[PDB]
Amino acid sequence: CQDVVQDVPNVDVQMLELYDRMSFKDIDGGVWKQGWNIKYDPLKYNAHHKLKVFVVPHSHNDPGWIQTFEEYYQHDTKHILSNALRHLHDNPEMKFIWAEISYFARFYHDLGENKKLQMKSIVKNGQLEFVTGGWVMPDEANSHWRNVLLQLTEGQTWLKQFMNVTPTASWAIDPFGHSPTMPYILQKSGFKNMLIQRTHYSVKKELAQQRQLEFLWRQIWDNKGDTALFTHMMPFYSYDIPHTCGPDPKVCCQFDFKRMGSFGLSCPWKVPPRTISDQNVAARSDLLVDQWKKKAELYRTNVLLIPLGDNFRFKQNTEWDVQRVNYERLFEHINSQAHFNVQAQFGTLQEYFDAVHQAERAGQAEFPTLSGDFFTYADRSDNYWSGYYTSRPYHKRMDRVLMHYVRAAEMLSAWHSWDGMARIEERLEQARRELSLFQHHDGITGTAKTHVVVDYEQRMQEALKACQMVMQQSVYRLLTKPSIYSPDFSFSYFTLDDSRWPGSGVEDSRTTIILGEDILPSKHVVMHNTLPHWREQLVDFYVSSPFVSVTDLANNPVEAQVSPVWSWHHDTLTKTIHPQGSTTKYRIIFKARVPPMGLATYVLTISDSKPEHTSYASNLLLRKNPTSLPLGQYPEDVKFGDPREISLRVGNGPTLAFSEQGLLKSIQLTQDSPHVPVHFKFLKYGVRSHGDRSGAYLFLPNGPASPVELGQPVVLVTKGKLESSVSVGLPSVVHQTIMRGGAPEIRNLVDIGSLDNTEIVMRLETHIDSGDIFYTDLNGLQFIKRRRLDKLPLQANYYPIPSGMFIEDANTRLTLLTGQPLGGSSLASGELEIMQDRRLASDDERGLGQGVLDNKPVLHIYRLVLEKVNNCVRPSKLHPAGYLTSAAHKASQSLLDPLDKFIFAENEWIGAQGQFGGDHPSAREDLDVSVMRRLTKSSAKTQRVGYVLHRTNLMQCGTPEEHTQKLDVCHLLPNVARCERTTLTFLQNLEHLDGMVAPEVCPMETAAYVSSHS
Ligand SMILES: *[C@H]1O[C@H](CO)[C@@H](O)[C@H](O)[C@H]1NC(C)=O
Ligand SMILES: [Zn+2]
């Protein structure tokens, strides 16, 4: 295995190093506004060395943005695809590329058989080519790598089944900045090439000057280069026709033949296209070939890519004709005029890349190596697209909840083969497709119109219900004596209980377990653990009495804690935000211990008085002018006091101190150790009163953030043996710090209300001497080093925080893990900050046509890990990556893949069993079974189950941490007949494995395996 820590890769371009050296000056470069006046030697091309030009027609189709998926399908996309089928069928030399399989599958299934056959023929013959082949073209900033792989697999599995093709070239022309997670997944999924477009204009200029726009993009930790994927970065400001023929848009716009009047389009540079004729073709060709030869100067081979397309293009039959016939007249002239030394034709993306690599093999070019990412994007001036790292945060959090429910539903149901009447495959395909659709670069990004956001939300709610159905049918089957199991596939044997989604204060969605001597004395509950190691975690349920005790199924008592159910109210009469306790519902909390990829059953039983193994939390309400807070049968009376500082410690864990405003002020790791300053603070950013305004995409603050004025907030302290917490009602945020014996959990119930033109940020202030360095993750997969640059504006220093961020010095590290993607930064040494929500009244001129005024309450979740790192083996100061410690990684897993909780619905569960998975191997802590999916339906004689195995890399800090078992996924199901290593989409077999054993993977590697069972 390669060492991902100690060997700094030697690459030609390392983006952090490039950023440190670049000046980012925004000067007027002439017609290429953000470049320079390109010059070329006319003698470079001649009869023995011609410029080969591939004009690649395309149409950018968004699966929701200004209209919903279905509205665009009906108004635009079905017509584009119907006319592409007709025009390509009738014009053999015409070509077209297509990226979004969600739309193509919607179209293809509605075609009659004759047309399905014509479509398969134009694909098989190379006229219509799929590029990437994912369900969508995903956002690359906020998306989790597991969901980028899920959507890629959904689209490619459909293409293999119906079209018999698997794309090996990727096309990503619209995500707002680009992540190395894409080549990581694509290279492990059979790809050979990829193309990107939205990168900072200063980066395009710098790389163009060195002819480094084509490069072998490897991961930041890859010393050998085996992760490398050839990448083509487009050079100009847009993928539209005016910015794809060459450097001068006033000229290129004349070659977009849809802009002459009858289509309602024109050229803003004021020179319209003119129909090509025999009297003007020489002058028009002279202008176009000049643009092409200028573009060619920015690249190393004699093969040139010229995209020809824009948003929802190629819709009307007359548009297909006007573009095709005019370009055909230009090609016939150009190709017959030797003095141009050009051979131009319509082509596909794969044809371009195959010709580039033929040139490379002929020794005509060598390409530079590159590592790093392409965030944060700016398309012009100081307009940095860091706002969408936070926009519509409710849905960003929903993404992560659904991510986990899809994994858990696919894994729980994979253990058995199911009859078709159970509708398991149907519900899982619906859930995978709605979560996949939301990965779109106007979905999770929060950049769609309000009614489109509602459509994505409704689709995801249906997907969550589908996952719940599959999960509860699977738990009932896995834990019921076989000869007793009698399923009704439409019945709810269990209901899921989720404590953090939508969350307390967001929706009252949880069911109370109703017990009583005259109705039901006890209730079975079941926990699932999707991770491949034994895991303990506190779990809580609402119960109708405080006198409840817990047992495992062998009837062994389990220690439990009961606390009140507290809800916060914005009291419009007293004008204060304060908590109310329930006098008939209570929370019971206990530690569940669950096998690897397994289930564990417990029983909750009511008694007439305080049970021996259940304790009760104390509660203290700090505020001036308190009023009583009765709690029904709860056995401990609420105490009151004036605001004051307080300290809490649960178990042997850290001791946390809080200010009189209920905000953390210090963390003391052990009895002996020091009280380290760690202060939470809430601040607000505003919007500029003149100049450009922040909107869904852009973050354009009117200077550094200002502190939220807190007043004298109400603080609630709950102290228990198993769990303690401090909660405070601040303006727009109920902020909660929860302690269970390890790193605290932070929950913010964020309701920005009607505060227009405001972005609320949560900042941590420490005295850690981090300087200008901080680390943020990319897609939940890797941590990359960031350097704050005072030569760039504040918004350029904001990066996506898809799952975590940290700062450190020689001795101390503070890591904040997140349960949802948000934007953040470290704007000064010792600080971390992360945006909570943003409400903007203005549109930011990128096409959305509205501000962001549809905010709703969201419960954000986090874990805060302060650690000593002086003993850790860390990368050298020149390495571009960082790595988590064991405790930080486990804290991230506690947020993203918590235990699932099921409450048995009926009064009695006949045939109930206590555990499932006790014999499953408990794998080393850095290994995860990211995906477990049965790939065959019940009628297949040979069953197949696919697994994606991911190993992260954790720092070595001196903990012996030992005894774990080897995990061989190919032997998790019995009767194994074959084990194969496959691409990550499961679509191609790469290796037949000896002994039917699937090896574990190396740190930072991901592999897929498929086991076959007789
Ligand atoms: C397409 O798939 C392979 C090449 O990928 C080809 O040999 C096969 O005949 C085609 N279609 C079928 C029958 O799978
Ligand atoms: Zn788009």
From Swiss-Prot:
Membrane topology summary: Single-pass type II membrane protein
Stated name of the protein: Alpha-mannosidase 2
Topology feature Lumenal, residues: 1-1014
Cellular component, GO annotation: endoplasmic reticulum; Golgi membrane; Golgi stack
Induction info: Inhibited by swainsonine and by copper sulfate.
Gene Ontology molecular function: alpha-mannosidase activity; carbohydrate binding; mannosidase activity; mannosyl-oligosaccharide 1,3-1,6-alpha-mannosidase activity; metal ion binding
Subunit comment: Homodimer; disulfide-linked.
Matches recorded under CDD domains: GH38N_AMII_GMII_SfManIII_like
Chief subcellular location: Golgi
Family indicated by similarity: Belongs to the glycosyl hydrolase 38 family.
Keywords per UniProt: Disulfide bond, Glycosidase, Golgi apparatus, Hydrolase, Membrane, Metal-binding, Signal-anchor, Transmembrane, Transmembrane helix, Zinc
Enzyme class per UniProt: hydrolase
Organism, as annotated: Drosophila melanogaster (Fruit fly)
Pathway where it operates: Protein modification; protein glycosylation
Subcellular compartments: Golgi apparatus membrane
Catalytic activity, reaction form: N(4)-{beta-D-GlcNAc-(1->2)-alpha-D-Man-(1->3)-[alpha-D-Man-(1->3)-[alpha-D-Man-(1->6)]-alpha-D-Man-(1->6)]-beta-D-Man-(1->4)-beta-D-GlcNAc-(1->4)-beta-D-GlcNAc}-L-asparaginyl-[protein] + 2 H2O = 2 alpha-D-mannopyranose + an N(4)-{beta-D-GlcNAc-(1->2)-alpha-D-Man-(1->3)-[alpha-D-Man-(1->6)]-beta-D-Man-(1->4)-beta-D-GlcNAc-(1->4)-beta-D-GlcNAc}-L-asparaginyl-[protein]
Catalytic center residues: D174 (nucleophile)
Cofactor note: Binds 1 zinc ion per subunit.
PANTHER family for the chain: ALPHA-MANNOSIDASE, LYSOSOMAL ALPHA-MANNOSIDASE
Function: Catalyzes the first committed step in the biosynthesis of complex N-glycans. It controls conversion of high mannose to complex N-glycans; the final hydrolytic step in the N-glycan maturation pathway.
